[PDB]
Symmetry: none
Subunit: 132 residues, 2 copies
């Protein structure tokens, strides 16, 4: 029963920035596999708190070297197949793992889509009790 | 500048207390009496409880003048900062978050309800550029 929600402007702006950055860093590389390998290489493990970058094509296929966390992979696949409009980036919550995208990206002279997964830690509650 | 979404639990809660306040004072025909009573439950300015604010559909904050001027400034700013009266959002004023508006009916008058509450958690903001 999901909910494609807007990405907060700061988050989206950031995503755009790291997209452009990744694009510029690997502008020399002509091998897509090498790029994906390098990019995903910077994660130290599955419990790595850092935002994880995912990729897909324009045909509904997630592109990744298999990573230690199957859950993030399931969530990403679901997100990719759940997209209603490839021109509007949105975010979806999978348990405690938020996923945002897609944003267009060019790697190895190929047009692909970038996404960002990151665990989302449920805000401290406010109450606001019935007894006024 | 940062009109952010209200977390679903928070928004759901806000809706619940809105409906609750609506049902509690359904008998009352005096708006001033309602506002007075509602705001009466706060014990002081340092009261940690979420503070309920009100406004009309003409940009005016409705409240009996209170102990905390800061919350009042923040609320006024929020009300005049609203881009769309049909989408509730939240804005951070220092450490004081303000969420709204949500429609409410008090004394057969259509008004808007807001909730202010101090926010003690600037992160989670973890991100990176080593990629």
């Amino acid at each position: 029963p999901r909910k494609a929600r807007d990405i907060p402007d700061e988050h989206y702006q950031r995503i755009i920035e790291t997209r452009d950055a990744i694009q510029n860093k690997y502008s020399k590389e002509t091998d897509l596999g090498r790029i994906l390998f390098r990019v995903e290489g910077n994660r130290a493990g599955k419990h790595d708190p850092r935002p994880r970058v995912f990729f897909s094509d324009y045909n509904g296929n997630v592109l990744t070297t298999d990573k230690r966390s199957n859950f993030q992979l399931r969530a990403m696949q679901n997100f990719v197949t759940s997209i209603e409009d490839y021109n509007k980036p949105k975010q979806r919550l999978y348990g405690r793992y938020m996923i945002a995208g897609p944003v267009p990206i060019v790697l190895a002279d190929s047009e692909l889509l970038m996404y960002v997964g990151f665990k989302w830690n449920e805000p401290p509650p406010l109450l606001l009790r019935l007894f006024d």
